[PDB]
Design an enzyme around this catalytic site. Sequence first.
Site, PDB file in Angstrom:
ATOM      1  N   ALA A  53       0.829  -1.213   0.000  1.00 51.50           N
ATOM      2  CA  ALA A  53       0.000   0.000   0.000  1.00 51.50           C
ATOM      3  C   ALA A  53       0.857   1.255   0.000  1.00 51.50           C
ATOM      4  O   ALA A  53       0.556   2.224  -0.681  1.00 51.50           O
ATOM      5  CB  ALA A  53      -0.933   0.027   1.213  1.00 51.50           C
ATOM      6  N   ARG A  84      -8.113   5.801  -2.522  1.00 49.47           N
ATOM      7  CA  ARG A  84      -7.249   6.928  -2.205  1.00 49.47           C
ATOM      8  C   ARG A  84      -7.452   7.970  -3.320  1.00 49.47           C
ATOM      9  O   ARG A  84      -7.252   7.681  -4.518  1.00 49.47           O
ATOM     10  CB  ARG A  84      -5.792   6.477  -2.096  1.00 49.47           C
ATOM     11  N   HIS A 183       7.021   3.198   1.333  1.00 51.31           N
ATOM     12  CA  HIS A 183       7.486   4.530   0.954  1.00 51.31           C
ATOM     13  C   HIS A 183       8.963   4.422   0.571  1.00 51.31           C
ATOM     14  O   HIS A 183       9.397   4.879  -0.493  1.00 51.31           O
ATOM     15  CB  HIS A 183       7.390   5.532   2.106  1.00 51.31           C
TER      16      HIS A 183
HETATM   17  S1  ICS Z   1       1.959   9.801   1.918  1.00 55.57           S
HETATM   18 FE1  ICS Z   1       1.150   8.772   3.762  1.00 55.57          FE
HETATM   19  S2  ICS Z   1      -2.231   7.408   5.822  1.00 55.57           S
HETATM   20 FE2  ICS Z   1       2.312  11.155   3.682  1.00 55.57          FE
HETATM   21  S3  ICS Z   1       0.825   6.560   3.748  1.00 55.57           S
HETATM   22 FE3  ICS Z   1      -1.124   7.546   3.895  1.00 55.57          FE
HETATM   23  S4  ICS Z   1      -1.747  10.927   1.043  1.00 55.57           S
HETATM   24 FE4  ICS Z   1      -2.091   9.587   5.256  1.00 55.57          FE
HETATM   25  S5  ICS Z   1      -1.301  11.110   6.721  1.00 55.57           S
HETATM   26 MO1  ICS Z   1      -3.773   7.821   4.124  1.00 55.57          MO
HETATM   27  S6  ICS Z   1       2.152   9.808   5.502  1.00 55.57           S
HETATM   28 FE5  ICS Z   1      -0.023  10.784   2.455  1.00 55.57          FE
HETATM   29  C1  ICS Z   1      -0.689   9.541   3.892  1.00 55.57           C
HETATM   30 FE6  ICS Z   1       0.139  10.847   5.097  1.00 55.57          FE
HETATM   31  S7  ICS Z   1      -2.509   7.311   2.180  1.00 55.57           S
HETATM   32 FE7  ICS Z   1      -2.286   9.503   2.658  1.00 55.57          FE
HETATM   33  S8  ICS Z   1      -3.893  10.157   4.061  1.00 55.57           S
HETATM   34  S9  ICS Z   1       0.511  12.601   3.712  1.00 55.57           S
END
Ligand code: ICS
Lengths: 517, 517, 458, 458
Positions: A53, A84, A183
């Site tokens: 993911a 998403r 990531h």
């Molecule tokens: S990439 Fe991360 S969980 Fe930084 S995996 Fe997640 S689109 Fe969240 S808080 Mo879902 S580290 Fe982005 C995030 Fe924040 S999927 Fe999105 S909102 S700013």
Amino acid sequence: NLKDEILEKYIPKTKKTRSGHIVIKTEETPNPEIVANTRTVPGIITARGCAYAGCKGVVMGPIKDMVHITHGPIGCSFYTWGGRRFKSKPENGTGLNFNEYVFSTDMQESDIVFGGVNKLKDAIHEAYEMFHPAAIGVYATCPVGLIGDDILAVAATASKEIGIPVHAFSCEGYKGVSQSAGHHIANNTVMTDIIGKGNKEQKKYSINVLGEYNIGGDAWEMDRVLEKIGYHVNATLTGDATYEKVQNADKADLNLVQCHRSINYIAEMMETKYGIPWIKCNFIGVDGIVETLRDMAKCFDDPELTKRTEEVIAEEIAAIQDDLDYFKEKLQGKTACLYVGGSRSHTYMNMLKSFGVDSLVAGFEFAHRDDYEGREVIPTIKIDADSKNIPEITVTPDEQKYRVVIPEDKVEELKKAGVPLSSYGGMMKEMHDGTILIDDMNHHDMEVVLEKLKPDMFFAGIKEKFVIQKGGVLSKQLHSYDYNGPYAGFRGVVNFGHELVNGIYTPAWKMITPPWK
Amino acid sequence: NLKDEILEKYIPKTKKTRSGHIVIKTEETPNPEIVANTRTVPGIITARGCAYAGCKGVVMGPIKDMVHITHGPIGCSFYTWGGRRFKSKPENGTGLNFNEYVFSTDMQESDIVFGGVNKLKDAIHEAYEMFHPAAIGVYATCPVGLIGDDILAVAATASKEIGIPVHAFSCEGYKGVSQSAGHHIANNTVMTDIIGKGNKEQKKYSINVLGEYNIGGDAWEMDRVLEKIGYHVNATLTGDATYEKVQNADKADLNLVQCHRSINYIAEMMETKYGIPWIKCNFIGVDGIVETLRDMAKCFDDPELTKRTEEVIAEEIAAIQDDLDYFKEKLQGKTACLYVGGSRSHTYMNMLKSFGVDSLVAGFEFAHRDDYEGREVIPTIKIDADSKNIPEITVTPDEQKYRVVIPEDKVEELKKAGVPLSSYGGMMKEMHDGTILIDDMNHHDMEVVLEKLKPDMFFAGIKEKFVIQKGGVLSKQLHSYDYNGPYAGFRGVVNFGHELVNGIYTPAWKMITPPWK
Amino acid sequence: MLDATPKEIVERKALRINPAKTCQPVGAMYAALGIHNCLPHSHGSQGCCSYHRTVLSRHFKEPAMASTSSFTEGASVFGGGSNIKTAVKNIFSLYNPDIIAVHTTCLSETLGDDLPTYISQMEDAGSIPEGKLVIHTNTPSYVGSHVTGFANMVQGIVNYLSENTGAKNGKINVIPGFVGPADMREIKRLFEAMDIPYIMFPDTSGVLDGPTTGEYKMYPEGGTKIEDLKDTGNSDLTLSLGSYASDLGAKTLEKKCKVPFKTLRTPIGVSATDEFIMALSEATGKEVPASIEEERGQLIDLMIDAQQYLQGKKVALLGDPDEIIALSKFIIELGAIPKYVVTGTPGMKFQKEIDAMLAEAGIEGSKVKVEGDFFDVHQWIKNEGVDLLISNTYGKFIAREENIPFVRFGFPIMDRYGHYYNPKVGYKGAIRLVEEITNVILDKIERECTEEDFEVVR
Amino acid sequence: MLDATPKEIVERKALRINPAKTCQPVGAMYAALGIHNCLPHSHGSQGCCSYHRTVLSRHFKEPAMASTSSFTEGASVFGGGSNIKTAVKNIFSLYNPDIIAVHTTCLSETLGDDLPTYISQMEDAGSIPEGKLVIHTNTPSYVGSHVTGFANMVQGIVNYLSENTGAKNGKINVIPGFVGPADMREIKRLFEAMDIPYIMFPDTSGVLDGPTTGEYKMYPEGGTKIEDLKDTGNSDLTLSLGSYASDLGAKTLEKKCKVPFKTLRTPIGVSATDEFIMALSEATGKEVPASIEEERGQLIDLMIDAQQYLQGKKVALLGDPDEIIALSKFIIELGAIPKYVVTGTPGMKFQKEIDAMLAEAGIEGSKVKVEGDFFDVHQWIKNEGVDLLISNTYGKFIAREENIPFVRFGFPIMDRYGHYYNPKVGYKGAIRLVEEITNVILDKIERECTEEDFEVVR
Ligand code: ICS
Ligand code: ICS
Ligand code: CLF
Ligand code: CLF
Ligand code: PRO
Ligand code: PRO
Ligand SMILES: [Fe+3]
Ligand SMILES: [Fe+3]
Ligand SMILES: [Xe]
Ligand SMILES: [Xe]
Ligand SMILES: [Xe]
Ligand SMILES: [Xe]
Ligand SMILES: [Xe]
Ligand SMILES: [Xe]
């Protein structure tokens, strides 16, 4: 004592391993230490996801003109079909856009046994013939690294034969402890195989926004404001991004890090290899946005741009001030908790403060000690057994390309001023005294928080949202923005605030108890 | 026989009155005499409407740039809001169109008591300033006659002040015995106060379609074909008509009478006053249409018209013969009953016969003996007490404008050749031997017909439709066309046939009895 | 569409356009169809009767039977006594109802026909077979609206049938008002769920929403039965749902038979349904069962789940006053704004109740109009747009011209199939409305949004 | 929209695009939530658990709880025995379910974990409190679909719980298949109307469609009770609704407990609902009551009333095999044409059943595809259009791109509010489907017709 009340129901072993994940901020312990990025305790009902993911779902997916093929059974793919909300459009109105699709090898039992590399080769060719994209991604899932498929090798053969890049990612879901490892995994291959490779000529005031994925149109709102000022946005990694534009990320003078956790790996390496610096930005909350733009103007150092800057701020804040006063009027004295991913728990704090909302509790799902405590603690960070086998990559100055965008002496005086060059201060310092952090907050925890503190609002995600509202408390999602946006930028603050007020003042919250009680 | 069976349950008085309204064709007596256009028996459950519906709802309403104001309480108005599907569009893409509105004086208690001429006056004025129509019409309803409002006077006064025609109609619902009285009342005022008042120069090959109201596009379809052949359709009374075109109604060389019952008055009077002859037409069913087009060609003689006539007929029939064969393959041998207003029970027969359907029963709601028996019987019709107060008017030949359109020897020569000039044979002649006619058929009568004859299909209206279908028998509406159309013209035949086949073959008809039965 | 309607408004004093009502007699015909083995009879010129049967069939896609006196000009000047007497003999012999329920039109009322006399002469001469009945009400079309017609027929039922014979039934009477057969079914289900004996009248369930069995049944299975209609005089209490439609019937029954009565809104939404349920429990000491509590909680859950799409939305509503008062309350409870609110039916109740709920919610500047019409509401919209339109079928023209998400509601709805199997009342009806409202709002959003703004989840 | 999708079809053998299925585990998680006081447990990496919980939350707008073993690379080497043991102890102590229902993923299945061993060692070690239960099934995601996961979990219920103690409960067992909680409620209403005693499992009603009471309740009121799941072995017969979802568990129940079983189509439409009612009547000799006969007759009346808008209409359908087989038959029953008919769930039965009903109706040239996807169907549509699209939420993209009237059906529907309160099964569900289908058809017609062809009545 709230820490105590949370830990209380945990059995001994669990009590011991969790305790370090929960810290209460005090003035005496201004810089308290937390435990983070450890494995999830089995059975405790976490919110976490997997490496796949973090890699395919989060960092890579948004690259719109690239075909992302999931090598696994069907779910890894289906569960990344539009959940998403990264926004994309055809570049300039005509570029390829695969946002509306998900691609998979739909592995079957035969593939688990005899291997899947032949279905994967065939999948890749079928996708090239059909779509002729800029690139194809191939993403590992749990079964892939155990059945012996060599997806790196398979991608090379196929990329030989077809004439375009084919990027393999070994993001099996059991790697690391969370989306975090994904990531890191994505950053590695992006750096080495995509950034730089661009043959395009830089431009005046060229910048990149890093760790920004254009959820509900956030990035377009940033860009809009950035361009009035005069900047050129060479690239946004990776919201509404084209492949070519990521290849050409090096063509810039300043890197802005919105989501530190997901993209910092690339921030660092771009500085090292190309000599491009970076600042932490926060394009959410008026305070955060202004503070950000004020910071960038300095790195550029330019009476005009610097003035144009403070101008656009004026007409933008002018345009919305009436709204801001309304939010504060309707929200003053309200209390909040925030549990988001690994960035937003913190970045949404200033906005809530300007609404006069008190943030009592915060946490990250999968962030590391440096997101809680700031990058200054990186030297003390011990990589543990569960993330040991996430690969580290090294880069070195590119001769024909490298540059010293900010003279050595100059850097240090900007840092002198409080300009976060190659730095991030962490969530904890921004929080009020006596507040509490909870890393990898689980259902049990959240419930104790809800009984004991009785917040007015609790920001989190889709799995928590209804649990919270069934108890009569408002939960607004800060991943999906409850299918709204932007929430970033100046227009974002208005969007956000109006949604929050509407949530709080929804009449039905008062009608829950039937009159026959 | 069947008539005996229908008459059985009637009480003696009723049995005696109704007996003459039901007749069976035999060779012993080819064209029997029927009783029609008499009072409705109270409590019998007729389908009939009132004179107001005949005048406002049927003849005048379709005039699209004229504002029709019901002077009465609200029902008379509301029940004419869109139920009758006369289609209208802005003349030339830009003219007025009030089809989507109904207008009323919405009489109250105080209006019944102190009279309503004042509210009427103000309504007329309100309507004029707001809409500035080509004309205004004012229509009486039941109580208007009783309380003594003088609507002719109000309309004259206002017409004087506002500078446009205001046409008053005394079509109180209780006049006559049915919608028919309403037709007559409308024709009277249209003739004297509208027709001939125009000032446009007559064009070549000019025809009018009289008694056509463009139900579901019927009239546009027949125009489409007429204009190809080469005619000028000077006016259609009153489907999709402008006020001005009705005024210019005299600017033609031939009147075509589709609905005889509604428009024959004006057809007689136009020939008397202007010398314009007419023929019966039937633009329903291929045979009806072809015969009509050929009759028009003989009346005009012009051999190019005659050639285009056969050219256009050839291509039109070419285009749809496959559908036509299909209809006949799927319907051959099936039996029908028809009970529609005062025209369509007869005009739809050629189409069903061409499909291979046998029409066992036919009737009109409110047609007169001449529609059943033919116009030859008119000298023998005795106006009865219930319709004697319907005003008759007389016209004389216009001293200046009158003209002999067709040499009187030509006239008589075409009548030899079978052209129906100033005549109409009636529905009975077209019917097969042993069939039955039922005037003002009521619920009782219909139920006996259904039980005894077990028809495959029974065409009628909305009030009968579900009564019939509740009994497992198909009922398609020939007033509203079940919200389809055109049903007239060449294209109409195909629309009607496909809807009929689809009705007959709907699978649910065979699913009525549950499996536990 | 509707091109002749101007933005700039000149108030109308006389010209009624696109009415938000129709005339009394169809309401009485509808009420009379809520009696078992009853043939409605229209005492006037046959035009009325045909029109009124037609609208019911158009709405329900069902047969709708009624007879008429078929006035001719002669009877329309000198009286309609022979017409109606002729009719009754033809009705009983040909069609054999157990009861003929007579109403009138502008014609017979203007004329001053004396039905009690006609009916007695008919009685005294033996024109009314043994064990058969004839009742009447007076329904002048120049007074009020179809809702008023419904109310008058209910009174008529009470006048002729309701007898307090002293033998208490232990039941609650409920006059459901001018609502559909689905709504009557839902109200009954709730009585039954609460384990409360009841008499509902009128009741068109099983009459105007019935099955196809392959045999046409002139008098359908449904309708409140004559003997039960009589027994209404022996109940403990009458609930009158919808004041305009139901009060007159309920007061009459108290006067005549000394059955007490409470007035309640048509139970649409949270408070109105709550008040209805609270009345049943407070009146019987009966406990509100789990099933009903679950339904309410599902509605609240839905109101909260869907809240973001409802908050602050501007709603235009037109219709009949009892239903619109209740619906307007529901709109406010959903967090939305009754912006334009109109009934064609005259009376101050509506002005008052609506003005009051707005004041209470702190809502300013909404337009409330009693005896307003569809032309009014359209002109308003042209001046300031709305986010939702709720009305009968005739709103579809405005919805299309102005591009407004549209909910079909009330009477008549003549252009859709199966709607008459769905209640709008109760927690169950409320859930349906919230679904239907958010469905049409989201349909428009997803139709019109930019492609890049298109969403999977909403 | 969907611009990259070309009209010219090159047939795919490897690349799966926009699947019309998802993987096993969510089907098992759904089945487990149809047990009262049960916590589903995903034994694998936690990404699966979060994803599967999320889709259930997005569909129902309700919480959906489950625990996970949270595999790390450590397990991918030593297996997940320590994880499941550690989980089970934290679960019982923190969250106290009465029963833990374990399913697996591709990770643990590929790795060859041995849950029966781990489970026995947990029993022996004392890790499972007295009065508490732990059951499991195996759900490899590379096999079948989520429907198969559901079928497997139901088999696991039987293995562990179903007990013939010799007694006769007098009940019939009903396995409703992979249908929504609304469908479960409606099936139970029908039983209860037929006056037939029964045990339904799984039953998610009162679990995924629950009220908001102001207190979050981790285990909601609904779910089939453990005591009754045991008592399933003591039943006269098992009705398996929808062979893909339900047969495995019914067969297993016969083997284990000697309870015979009959297989039936998911009851959607006329013949399928008829078949279900006739099974019930025949099994018990009980009479179909009047209420149920009225519903069926209302549906027939609606099919006939609405016929003109249905006859010859071309329908594209995609979804789960049990539901789409029945819905396809209903389509034919309505006089319409199943033109494109697809399920992502593998298996021969769909192929045979759909082919057969098309052949019987004399319908030629429809495309039926097993393991087809949304890309398949859109390509087909591009080559020849349809009049109606029925699918889950993901069809909305095609509906918009090609301008096709769209009916949301099956799983998952994540973009509307309150749909989960409405059944698609039974005569009542069938009536809802016909209203919805004709509504969307009429909406488009009235939207796009010329102003002069616009209509009051339809
Ligand atoms: S990439 Fe991360 S969980 Fe930084 S995996 Fe997640 S689109 Fe969240 S808080 Mo879902 S580290 Fe982005 C995030 Fe924040 S999927 Fe999105 S909102 S700013
Ligand atoms: S005018 Fe007449 S009842 Fe000739 S009142 Fe009636 S739109 Fe009928 S059979 Mo409705 S004499 Fe026209 C008629 Fe025929 S309203 Fe239409 S269909 S061809
Ligand atoms: S932790 Fe992550 S999402 Fe889970 S499998 Fe592993 S990479 Fe994938 Fe895909 S098909 Fe389904 S959802 Fe899994 S069970 Fe097999
Ligand atoms: S036979 Fe004809 S339609 Fe009847 S009234 Fe008379 S002119 Fe009119 Fe209008 S308001 Fe209603 S429907 Fe009547 S009862 Fe008074
Ligand atoms: O509200 C309704 O649905 C019904 C229809 C007829 C009378 N009122
Ligand atoms: O409504 C339905 O059919 C699906 C089945 C499982 C979840 N809901
Ligand atoms: Fe019907
Ligand atoms: Fe919910
Ligand atoms: Xe810079
Ligand atoms: Xe928000
Ligand atoms: Xe002519
Ligand atoms: Xe037809
Ligand atoms: Xe008016
Ligand atoms: Xe495929």
